[PDB]
Structures are given as structure tokens and as C-alpha cells.
Amino acid sequence: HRLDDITARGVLRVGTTGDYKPFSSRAGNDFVGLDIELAADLARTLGVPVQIVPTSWPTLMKDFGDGKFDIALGGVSITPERQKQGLFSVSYLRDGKTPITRCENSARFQTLAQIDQPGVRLVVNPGGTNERFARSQAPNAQLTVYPDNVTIFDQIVTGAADLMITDAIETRLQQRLRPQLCAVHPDTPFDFAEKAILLPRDVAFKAVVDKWLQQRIASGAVQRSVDRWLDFPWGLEPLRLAIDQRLLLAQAVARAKWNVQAPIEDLGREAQVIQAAVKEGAALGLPKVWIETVFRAQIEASKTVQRELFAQWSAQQAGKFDDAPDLAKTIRPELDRLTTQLLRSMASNQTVLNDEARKADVARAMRALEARALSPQAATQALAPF
């Protein structure tokens, strides 16, 4: 050999699902997380760039068999099924199986006796140790199984489910991200699982990986990384997404303006925009100066997109577009919705955004905008206030 093939191809290909913070999370076309760092470190060690190849729990083992990637990670537990189709590295994290519940329900689910009752709505992700644990150790509970992380935690906050039993490190993170939730005794779990890297059936390759991984464990680098990634400002994702979507919508603004011969810059509608933003943002307890800086940057980024598209259409001598939505009617509602999302997310994240020491993490969290492909200058101006 596998090493031979990786050398000859010039890339380490790494399968991951990118929906399991803090191991592996997709921000745009970017992946970030503890397992992403590990992959990039192993690649560097092997003398090649890394390529992250997205996959999903249902196609994980198939994609692996189809040769879509060399190794797989992303908070992958050692299970017997996965063992039958490859080798695992040595484990780099031993983690507990423990509950996360609405905080007011914490005392109701501290024992497996309480949990394993006919009344209990237990949700879990499919195909791994959590589902095996739930079916085995809480069979008297009503069990539902979901492929999407967001859905499980939303279900628990919103009262559609009662608890999840999952890795302790997830309970720790989600307790922070979803303040209505509490991990239940995560340091003293019901059982343990081992996180490892899924490797091909190549004993020599495994020896190289194991040698590298054990050095990183012994040196404290893995523990250091776990701690940083658990502390990472994952709650910035809605703010990144609102910025990115607002900016991508400027393509539609530009199409509509081109058709009716409207100037790009409209300092009147700009005043209305900043004014409504300052009003709503002030009700959220955000300082007016924060708000004005951020939205002035968003408006300028938008015009930069518009001007670049007009510049292309001018040279190409483009006519009218039939794929052009109504500006005042349907685009500006969307813009207003995204403005609200951006303000609410700023408010949720105000401590992180106020901490100079976090700038590097904030950069990592926010820099991956799809809109960059559309305009690198616009992307930089949108992110400049942060």
C-alpha cells in the first residue's frame, strides 16, 4: 504494498463522513477536526499531500472496498464488521458510552435501570457501537436511528427524543454547543469504545502507521490535539454559512440588475439595511459599532461580486437572463432572513468573537467560503471584520 501505491500515486486518500465534530466536520469544501489533522500529519510523514474523500456511513465500507480511499477515519470505532474488511491502527482514543439529556432530565437518566424502560425515547446513530449498545443494554426502550448528527441533537433539545447514549467526548462538546443539554457522568461511563484508523489488509503498512501514531500518543500530541479540537469554536458554523449564502445570493442580485439596467451601488437601500441591522442587533445586545462594521463589509463584498459579474457580462456582450429572480420581491426577503441569521449567530458567538487570542481558530472556522471560488476579493472583504 500500500505504501508503494501511495508513493506512486503521490497522495494519501482518506475517507471520512465529515459530520462528527470534533473528529471530522465539513465546512464548505473544507474539512477540519482532530482526525483531519491526524490525516494531514500522517501524509506529511509519508511525503505526500493528503486528499480528504467524503463518504457516508452506508457506503463507508463499500467505498473502502471500491478503492475510493486508502484509509478511513472520523471518530471511527473498532467494530467486528469493520475488522472483517480491513485492519485497524492502534487506538488513539478510548472513550466512554454515556448519556446526554436535557439538563433538567439529568437525574432521570443516570442509571441503566432508569434508561431501559418502556417509556424512554432513545435515539442513536446507525451501524456502530452506539446502536449495538442501545439494542443490547436498553432493549425495553423505544429506539430510533438517524444518519444525521444535527437531527439527533435537535430532537433531544426540542423534546422529540429523550436522550442519546454516545461517546463521552461528543456529550462534552454537545453540552457546550447546545446549552439546554448536559452530559451525564462522562468520566464514569457504562462501557468504553476505541477510536482508530481503518487501514487496508497490509501488515507492513499497519506497522508504519502504528509507529507514527504511538510516537504522537507518547509525546502528548494526540492529547493536545483532542483538547484544542474540543475547545474549537464550532458554534461559528451558522455565522460562516450566513455570510457565505448572503454573498452567493449577490449572483442573483446581479442578474436581476443587469436586466433592468440598475446601478450596482444604491447607498439608499444600504442605509435601510444598516439601520434595520443595527436595530435588530441592538435588541440582541450587540454593540452598534460591531454591527455597522460587519454589515458595511457584507454590502461591499456583495458589490464586489456584482461588479465582477457585470465586468464579465460587459466583455462577453451578454444579453438578458431568463434565470433571473425578482429582486425586490424574492431576493431581498432572503437577504433579510440571512441578515437575521448573521446577527443571531454573532450574538451566540460574542465571547469568541471578542477574544483576540482566538483569531487563528476563528480564521480556520470561517475562511472556507464557497463564495471565494466566485470572488476571492469579495470573500476577503466579507471576512475582514472578523
Ligand X SMILES: O=C(O)[C@@H]1C[C@]2(C(=O)O)C=C[C@@H](O)[C@@H](C2)O1
Instruction: Kindly state whether residue 336 participates in binding ligand X, applying the rule CB under 6 A.
Output: no
| Rounded CA separation 213/219 (Å) | 10
| CA atoms in the 13 A half-sphere facing the CB of 25 | 23
Q: Which is closer to ligand X, CB of 149 or CB of 251?
A: 251
Distance of closest approach, residue 133 Cβ to ligand PPY, in angstroms: 8
Q: Which is closer to ligand X, CB of 194 or CB of 334?
A: 334
Region binding ligand PPY by CB under 6 A among candidate stretches 162-170, 249-257, 285-293, 313-321: 162-170
Q: Which is closer to ligand X, CB of 38 or CB of 277?
A: 277
Region binding ligand PPY by CB under 6 A among candidate stretches 164-172, 174-182, 248-256, 377-385: 164-172
Distance of closest approach, residue 369 Cβ to ligand PPY, in angstroms: 26
Within 268-287, which residues bind ligand X (CB under 6 A)?
A: 269-270, 273
Sign (positive or negative) of CA dihedral 12, 15, 19, 22: negative
Distance of closest approach, residue 155 Cβ to ligand PPY, in angstroms: 14
Question: In sequence order, what DSSP letters do the residues of 83-151 get, joined into one string?
Answer: HTTSEEPPPSEEEEEEEEEEGGGGGGGSSHHHHSSTT-EEEE-SSSHHHHHHHHH-TTSEEEE-S-HHH
With CB under 6 A as the contact rule, the residue among 36, 236, 335, 366 that binds ligand X is: 335
**23 backbone dihedrals φ, ψ, rounded to 5°:** -80, -45
- Burial of 143 (C-beta count, 10 Å sphere; 0-12/13-18/19+): middle
Residue 313 is which amino acid?
W
Instruction: Kindly state whether residue 95 participates in binding ligand PPY, applying the rule CB under 6 A.
Output: no
Region binding ligand PPY by CB under 6 A among candidate stretches 122-130, 171-179, 289-297, 327-335: 122-130
- Burial of 80 (C-beta count, 10 Å sphere; 0-12/13-18/19+): exposed
Instruction: Kindly state whether residue 125 participates in binding ligand PPY, applying the rule CB under 6 A.
Output: yes
Interface residues with ligand X (CB under 6 A)? Answer: 253, 265-266, 269-270, 273, 299, 302-303, 335
